[PDB]
Design a protein around this ligand. Sequence first.
Ligand code: MOK
Lengths: 140, 141
Amino acid sequence: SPGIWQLDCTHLEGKVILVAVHVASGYIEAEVIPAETGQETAYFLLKLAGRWPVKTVHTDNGSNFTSTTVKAACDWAGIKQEDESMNKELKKIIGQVRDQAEHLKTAVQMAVFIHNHKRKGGIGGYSAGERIVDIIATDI
Amino acid sequence: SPGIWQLDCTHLEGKVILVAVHVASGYIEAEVIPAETGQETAYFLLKLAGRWPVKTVHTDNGSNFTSTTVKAACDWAGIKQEDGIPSMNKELKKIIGQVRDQAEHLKTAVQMAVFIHNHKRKGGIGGYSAGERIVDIIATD
Ligand SMILES: Cc1onc(-c2ccccc2)c1C(=O)O
C-alpha cells in the first residue's frame, strides 16, 4: 500500500540517525541529527511528505512524535501518525563503508545510496528505488 | 530526458537554499544550507543521488562545484557533472511568501514550499503534479 512509511531512530557514535522506510518497497530516507527533538522530527516529516506521497507514518512512541510542532506539521502535510530488518541492514551497510569518509553523516548517505540502488535477486530483479517508483506510478 | 537534474541556488533572508530540479518533470528537492561550500554541496548531491537515479547534473559552475570534494562525490555516485550548461527560483520564492508566516523558521517554510510545488496540479483539472510526472517518467516497469 503506497502511502505507508515507517520511521525509526538509530543511535550510533552518540549521534541519532532518523530512518524512514517505505514499507511496500524497502526504499529508505535517512538523516543524522544532533538530537531526537520535536523540531527535528517535524522538519524530517515535512521533508519526506513534500518528496513522496505520504499518507501514514508508523513510529515508536517517543515524545518527539507528540509535540505540538510535529502535530502541526502532520496536520499541515496530511500525515496520519500511528503506532526493522531494513534498519539492521542500513547499520550493516554503514559498517561496510564507515571507513571511506571522515564523517558519520557521509557514511550514512553512502549507505542509503547503496541500499536504494542495490538490485535484489538476479537478472530480472529490482532495487528498492525501482520498487517505490513502480508502486507509485502503478497506483497513479 | 529522465536522469538529468539542474542545480541552482537561491538566496533569502541571508540564507542559502540549494535547489535540484528534475528537468523533465519540474519536480524539486531543496535544502537550506549554511553557505555554498564544497562539503555541503557534495553532501547535497550524494543525498539526491541516493534518492533518485541521477545520471547528469547541470550546474551554474559556481566555485562550490569546482571543489575537489564535489568531484569525488560525483565520481563515487556515478554522476556526470556538467558545469555551465544553461527559473524555479522565482516560483519557489513566491510559494515561500505564501507560507512564510506559518513557520517560525525559513528552513521550515522552504520545505512547505517544496511540498506545495511538487503537489500542485499543472495544466488544468486533467493535469498532473511534478510528483506524478517524475514517477511516471522514471518508472521502468
Ligand atoms: C496524487 C499523487 O500520487 N503521487 C504523487 C506524488 C507526490 C509527490 C512526489 C511523488 C509522487 C501525488 C501528488 O499528490 O502529487
